[PDB]
Enzyme design. Structure first.
Site, PDB file in Angstrom:
ATOM      1  N   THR A   1       0.827  -1.200   0.000  1.00  0.00           N
ATOM      2  CA  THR A   1       0.000   0.000   0.000  1.00  0.00           C
ATOM      3  C   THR A   1       0.865   1.254   0.000  1.00  0.00           C
ATOM      4  O   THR A   1       1.879   1.317   0.692  1.00  0.00           O
ATOM      5  CB  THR A   1      -0.935   0.001   1.198  1.00  0.00           C
ATOM      6  N   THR A   2       0.460   2.250  -0.784  1.00  0.00           N
ATOM      7  CA  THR A   2       1.176   3.518  -0.838  1.00  0.00           C
ATOM      8  C   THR A   2       0.186   4.627  -1.156  1.00  0.00           C
ATOM      9  O   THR A   2      -0.540   4.545  -2.151  1.00  0.00           O
ATOM     10  CB  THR A   2       2.292   3.489  -1.887  1.00  0.00           C
TER      11      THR A   2
ATOM     12  N   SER B   1       4.013   1.110   2.808  1.00  0.00           N
ATOM     13  CA  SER B   1       5.253   0.356   2.649  1.00  0.00           C
ATOM     14  C   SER B   1       6.162   0.990   1.602  1.00  0.00           C
ATOM     15  O   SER B   1       7.385   1.031   1.778  1.00  0.00           O
ATOM     16  CB  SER B   1       4.941  -1.093   2.282  1.00  0.00           C
TER      17      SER B   1
END
Lengths: 214, 223, 223, 222, 214, 234, 215, 223, 223
Positions: B1-2, B141
């Site tokens: 996830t970003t 992350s």
């Protein structure tokens, strides 16, 4: 009869409020001016609720002092919970009105108090000061120019209605307030909600400073 | 996830990826991670997906509840404080494996300068918050790669469209360096979601514009 | 255990196996794992059998209780939220060894397009729910094999009967690659149970049709 | 311990052994493990003896309490649910060494077909219940041997007497392959106890009939 | 009806207070002097509240003794919480007034007591001693010179008003107090809040010392 | 993180750095660690940033709440006691990794001598407080280096300006010997924040003066390095 | 009317106290002597509260017995908390007065009791014995010579006031007490003393042949 | 830390050092460890500094509270019992590192012989108290060395001045053998604090007298 | 610590040593371990000194409280039961290092035979009590040596004086074989304390008689 009980409570509260001193609060150019007839040096009928909120009351001391402490607690809790700028005088007035209505309805004796909540604009902001009067029965009214509480208000109300002048300086406002209150320093308590203050607007003017303005 | 967020003159834009994984296995391909909490703020939350969805829902409910009760919306600092309180209260569950790190972007109507009313706030695991002053921030992350790409690409941001393009490129780099971050799926036609906030409020970005930007970036990288 | 659910034009079909084991020993041969919660939703639960039965019973009771109290059935998202709340509340028991992962398939009457009113919802251990968009999903120990089989067989799904055949074949593959999932027992005449949901409601599939499909699949695999 | 139950046309029969042990030492030789909970159900509980006795007593008390309060006996599924709730609630004590696994056999008065009204219900450690459709079930340490024996002997069951003989032989096999299960004691004259349930209710099998069956089996295998 | 009960309670409390002894407390050069018409040797009407705060009362013993214990508890809690110098006689007087008002309003029978809270300045500091009187109803009055409680106060008050002298020595103050109280050492209780003491101002003057002073 | 405070004739000055880190990574560059709790006291807290901010806000709220309720501000010892109580209460969280060590500096209006009215109070993990009467104190990871630098530089303090210069130089030395403490960032124009308290109250120091002092200190250090050598070798 | 209620309660308590037997306690050279009119053998109106503190009461038995038990509990708790020498009869009298005032004001019926708390000096110490009388309404009075409670107190009080001898011996004090009380052998009288010469516990009962010989 | 107390004809004297340490680093140089709890008793507490200050403050508050409530001060044994109760109640926190060992010295006005009215009481970690009969006692890390020095020096005590000199010399020996105990700092002019209690009450010893005694001792041991 | 009790015709005698130690260090030399609970019973407690003192104080307070409440002293079995209940309640603290083992010696006034009215009761860590029928008992670290000495010396007991001498000699042997038990200190003139109970009540033995007995024993064992 419940109507008779309401009449008795209203008469008792009116008699109690009329027997106390008279407190007048009017808005001027620099904010809100508080002038009260208080001979005592320890007991104070004018206090600070928050950064831009003031307090004024007339009547039985042990009742509105407790209400003032409760309002200070509520304001501090609200300021710490969300933010300092989320606290407004309208919320304090609403809480006071609800509490006074509950006391007037459920408690054995109604509070012989008459509260005044004032609010000024934040620093670097422009807004007309707000005044709120809360009565013993919970009714709350909004006054645009001045609030007169305690004792015989009709002569003082008429004198202010005839002599009030908006955007007047501090000296003229103090003179008008004292002159209408009569209808010295040792028998008057004076505080101001100075809108020019950075964060905390409440400020007391006593001693030689009060004498100079008179 | 970003999830990325950057400031442009007159507003703010937030974008996020679409991939959710259970270890190495890919479990989702169309996860939406950017929410519109109210008319002028957007919240993106990284970490465990369930905790993120619950946090977004509860935060929106709390903000609307206060607005309806008091007849006036909370100030921006009040919203920051409420979100920080939620993050702090989630610490015990976070230590057990239910960590959630939010990212708040909003527009301050009461701010003096309209062109600098955009706000970006980042939170840590202890509930501490910091108002970003460098113009961009990222969580997740792949946050480090996206942040380093934005450090080099932020000089090209002059309006909303350029900011959106830079955010999409940063997400592309984060997906290029992180396996947990999903890139633009051209086969399935799945692209990152974005929200643009300005004086007119917060609106969702149509998928066609993001698809065009992603295709342009891919063609630039291929050549 | 393996429970599969896939969408077909005009409805949705859910099927599950019939085997329950205690380690390597076989304890049950006719366990039913697919339940009809109400007129338009079906729930299949995998994991510990006792927890699955308790979950299905409690969920059906809660849904009917709300419908009777309010005089109007819950919306689909409300049912999803209640099921997710139950799954999240069972987290401590799942950590202690009582894990239960449900699978929800339903038909949304209030949906705009009748042909796309079928819905499939999957859940994780933390309570996170995702509405499946690829048209199929599976849970259980043999879920990966069934999902991979459906990934190749979904192009043949054109109606309820073809979807039922595909689901049965996916269960057959899952049993063929997983010893915890039981296959069609021709000696005892025990076959997987299936539920078909459409605009007319959810009805149990008769055993004869499933037996015919299973025999056809076995004969196809033999030659 | 080993308790067996099987279905025959017109009813169900449940039998259990008589031995209780503390490790390798034999502490009891005439323990009764099959209880007549009510007029149409019998319960056999394996595991710790104290927990089994307490469970049987409490279950019978609850069933009779409901029947007296409501003026109508519980349905069979209600009895299953109550027993499952008790087993599930005993999970914390079971994990500490006080496990009790029950086995419920009954006759359904409200069933449609009288010849198939017999019911056998098995329970697991998590409180889950399953109505057995194979016709037989067993619990205890020697349960696997008894079930494997019944898998081969069930084709001979045609009435109550044949079913009782099959149950006795299954218990004999379980005791033959398990040291914790007690076999027929021909020196002290102690034999397993059995209960037969049919349309007329549940009755205890007299010891003479079981002794005859056990002696016949022993002479057959000698 | 509420006013009838108010007058009933006021008359009951006034009659109860008037039936008791008289206590006089006046401020002199060395601090505050306490003199009480107390014939007993074990029961005491004068006590210490904190380092610079004294206590005096008249009326029913079991009521003002309980009030004294409550005040001591409050003062010690406040001193340990923030600091010893944060405890002032004003806070104690406010607490006493609130408690007495609550008792007068909510309890079956009002307390027939009349309190006196005195406070002197700290060591090495100059400040006029403060005297506070709290009545049965809850009203609190600030007295700059002297306080008279219990029994017939009018002759004693007039005698003090005629014979009062500021900055009087301890001997002169004792003579004035005794002379006004009459209008022996065996039936007199004497205590002083000596501002010259470093920390604890309260000190009892009994025995041959009182005879020497008189 | 490093916060320094020192006494000068007629007042007190407190300054702190601007860096926050998560391990070796630099997560913040303009964090403010010195707060003005009321008109005559300033508080700086080191450790976890979130706990520091929460403590500062709660302490200011408590002080203002008491002042509004009673109509008279707390004495200095009362404020010390309240802060010590808060620190003692946070012991369980400190044992779990949420430590916060405050540093209190203030001006005592009720003090006898106006020139010696400045006060510096240091706290430990157990809530114990000691009124430092040697003229300076420091907290944080780089506190030892700053304290040792102030030990040699305190003889130059004669007024507010010299005290501010000494505080800035102590922070510079602490950042020079500690990686967790940020130094003067000339590229981004970020400098430590300072607060000066005197008889007229506590006022924030403008950034321009601190920037000038930092530039002068950096130029002096560069010139000294140019003049100095390794016993004759550069 | 609250005044009417107060007068009613006062009359009720006075009638209850006057209808009971009479208890007299007087101080002598060796301590405090307790003499009470008690025809019973199990019920006792004289008891011990602590090492140097005695107890005497007259009126309804089940009320002052409960008060005596409460006072014993308080004395033991105070002695174990701080120290034995920190317990004085003054504190017991104050507690009794507060409790009786609360009962007389708040309870439906006031207690028809009249208490007497006596205290003597410690071993090797010289101090005048202290006598306290506590009434039904909470009033507490200090008596330097003797306390008379219960029944018609006027004739006994006058007889004691005329026949009181300071520093009298035990036999003379007992004779004076009995003679004033009658204005009555071992079967109808209970006698106990607070012997100040005792090392730790001063309370002692004088009954049986010893009482008859002392008579 | 080291606190010493000894009896002299007609009174008792207690003295303590001024150093506080955090491991090996010296954190304090003018710590006061001897308190005047009331007019006739003095309390010295060793261990954690914060716990010692809190104990002294709470003990003084409790004693004054009882004196004001009852109008008569507690007996000496009552004070001993209250201090022992506090120490016993602090045992759980002492096991965690917050150890506080007090030392009580007082003058008994109610004692028979005025010349033997001095009292010294020592406490242990379990709250046990023992009235010392040897005439001296010491607590702290350097307690053993100070006690052994007082054992050889107590024969010279004949009045208050000789007792004060012996106490100062014992503290000097304890600091000479214990690094956690601070000695007379001639550079900074910091000297141990002492309290003398007699029939006239408890008074603080002026710093000049202690400095003169310390200089005399140092000059005696320098040659 | 070592406390001994033995019966003689017409009463009972209990004696104890005077030493308290903290490891190998000697912390006390005049500790009194034998208490007179009431007119006809004496209690000696071994173990932790603070717990012993607290136990003796609480037990005496409870017995006197019952006597004052009911107007009649408890029976001897009632006193035994109360002490056993206290010991049983102290089990959790004993397991934490605060063990206290009491020893009860009393004279039964209600006993039929005045010459056999002496009673000795011993308690264990679980609160169990046993009335000794052999005439002697001991508690403490040196209890075994004292009991073995009394087993040989009990034939010489004919009255109170001989019993006291035997008790002193048993304490001497216990101190001779146990370092935690202190022997007669002739340098400081400190001797064990003893209590003799007979029909006239419990009285403390004067120090001079015990000193004479100890000197006689020492002279006998010297040669």
């Amino acid at each position: 009869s419940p109507e008779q009980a309401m009449r008795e409570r209203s008469e008792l509260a009116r008699k109690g409020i009329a027997r106390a001193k008279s407190v007048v609060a009017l808005a001027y150019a620099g904010g809100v001016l508080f002038v009260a007839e208080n001979p005592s040096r320890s007991l104070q009928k004018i206090s600070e609720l928050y950064d831009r909120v003031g307090f004024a009351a007339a009547g039985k001391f042990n009742e509105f002092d407790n209400l003032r402490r409760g309002g200070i607690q509520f304001a501090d809790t609200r300021g710490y919970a969300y933010d300092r700028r989320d606290v407004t005088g309208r919320q304090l007035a609403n809480v006071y009105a609800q509490t006074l209505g509950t006391i007037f309805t459920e408690q054995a004796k109604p509070y012989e108090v008459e509260l005044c909540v004032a609010e000024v604009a934040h620093y670097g902001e422009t807004k007309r000061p707000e005044l709120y009067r809360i009565t013993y029965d919970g009714s709350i009214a909004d006054e645009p120019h001045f609030v007169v509480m305690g004792g015989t208000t009709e002569p003082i109300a008429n004198a202010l209605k005839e002599s009030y002048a908006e955007n007047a300086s501090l000296t003229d406002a103090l003179r008008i307030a004292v002159a209408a209150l009569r209808a010295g320093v040792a028998s008057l308590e004076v505080a101001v909600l100075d809108a020019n203050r950075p964060r905390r607007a409440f400020r007391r003017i006593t001693g030689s400073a009060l004498q100079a303005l008179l | 996830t970003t999830i990325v967020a950057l400031k442009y003159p007159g507003g703010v834009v937030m974008a996020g990826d679409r991939r959710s994984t259970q270890g190495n296995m890919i479990s989702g391909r169309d996860v939406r991670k950017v929410y519109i909490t109210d008319d002028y703020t957007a919240t993106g939350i990284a970490g465990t997906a369930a905790v993120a969805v619950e946090f977004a829902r509860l935060y929106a409910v709390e903000l609307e509840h206060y607005e309806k009760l008091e007849g006036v919306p909370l100030t921006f600092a009040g919203k920051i404080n409420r979100l920080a309180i939620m993050v702090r209260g989630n610490l015990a569950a976070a230590m057990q494996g239910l960590l959630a790190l939010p990212l708040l972007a909003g527009y301050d109507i009461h701010a003096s300068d309209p062109q600098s009313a955009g706000r970006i706030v980042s939170f840590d695991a202890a509930g501490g918050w910091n108002i970003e002053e460098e113009g961009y921030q990222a969580v997740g992350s792949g946050s480090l790669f996206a942040k380093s790409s934005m450090k080099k690409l932020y000089s090209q941001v002059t309006d909303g469209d350029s900011g959106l393009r830079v955010a999409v490129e940063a997400l592309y780099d984060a997906a290029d360096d992180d396996s947990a971050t999903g890139g633009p799926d051209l086969v399935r036609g799945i692209f990152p979601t974005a929200v643009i906030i300005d004086a007119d409020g917060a609106v969702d970005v149509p998928e066609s514009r993001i698809a065009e930007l992603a295709r342009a970036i891919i063609e630039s990288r291929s050549g």
